[PDB]
Scaffold this motif. Structure first.
Motif, short mmCIF file in Angstrom:
data_model
loop_
_atom_site.label_atom_id
_atom_site.label_comp_id
_atom_site.label_asym_id
_atom_site.label_seq_id
_atom_site.Cartn_x
_atom_site.Cartn_y
_atom_site.Cartn_z
N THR A 120 -21.36 -68.40 65.25
CA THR A 120 -21.25 -66.95 65.11
C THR A 120 -19.81 -66.53 64.86
OG1 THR A 120 -22.56 -67.13 67.16
CG2 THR A 120 -22.61 -65.02 65.99
N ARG A 143 -23.74 -66.79 60.88
CA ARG A 143 -24.12 -65.60 61.63
C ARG A 143 -22.89 -64.78 62.01
NH1 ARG A 143 -28.20 -69.15 63.67
NH2 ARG A 143 -28.54 -70.44 61.80
N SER A 153 -30.63 -68.55 58.28
CA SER A 153 -29.33 -68.36 57.64
C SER A 153 -28.38 -69.50 57.99
CB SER A 153 -28.72 -67.02 58.06
OG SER A 153 -29.26 -65.95 57.30
N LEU A 192 -31.22 -64.52 60.68
CA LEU A 192 -30.16 -65.40 61.18
C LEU A 192 -30.68 -66.82 61.39
CD1 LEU A 192 -30.84 -65.79 64.46
CD2 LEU A 192 -30.17 -63.38 64.44
#
Length: 146
Positions: A100, A68, A65, A62
């Motif tokens: 997220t 997420r 990344s 993550l």
């Protein structure tokens, strides 16, 4: 001077799915796969595991990344340590990056996470679409990319 984008991107995004709702994750990536050969996928639910034990390499993934995703499990809300970390991702430190995406599968609307405790909800299709919002929220990051 020459140049290349071989080590420009390590991983697009690692979506955390449940052991029982793992299929959902497989269906998600399936979409992004449609794009060019820029998106990378990883399916592991056929052959045995490396040793048998489960490793947590997502914490680092993550970090490297672009997006997420988290899957609100039934046990999480049941556990204090789990929930304690839930609102933590939303109330993260100031100037923090890593949006997220709230993913709910088989959860009670009343037992929904605090992430949806804001007026600025998710816009797009219209109705409550955790799978449609997560698929659009991720690909969106690539849309801007070349």
């Amino acid at each position: 001077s020459n140049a290349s984008s071989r080590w420009s991107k390590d991983y697009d995004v690692c979506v955390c799915h449940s052991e029982e709702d793992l299929v959902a994750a497989q269906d998600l990536v399936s979409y992004l796969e449609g794009s060019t050969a820029s998106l990378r996928c990883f399916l592991q639910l056929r052959d045995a595991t490396p040793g048998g034990a489960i490793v947590s390499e997502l914490c680092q993934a993550l970090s490297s990344s672009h997006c997420r995703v988290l899957l609100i499990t039934p046990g999480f809300l049941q556990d204090p340590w789990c929930k304690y970390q839930m609102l933590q991702a939303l109330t993260e430190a100031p100037g923090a990056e890593g949006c997220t995406i709230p993913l709910l599968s088989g959860l009670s609307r009343a037992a929904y996470p605090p992430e949806l405790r804001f007026m600025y909800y998710v816009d797009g299709r219209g109705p409550d679409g955790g799978f449609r919002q997560v698929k659009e929220a991720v690909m969106r990051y690539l849309q801007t990319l070349s």
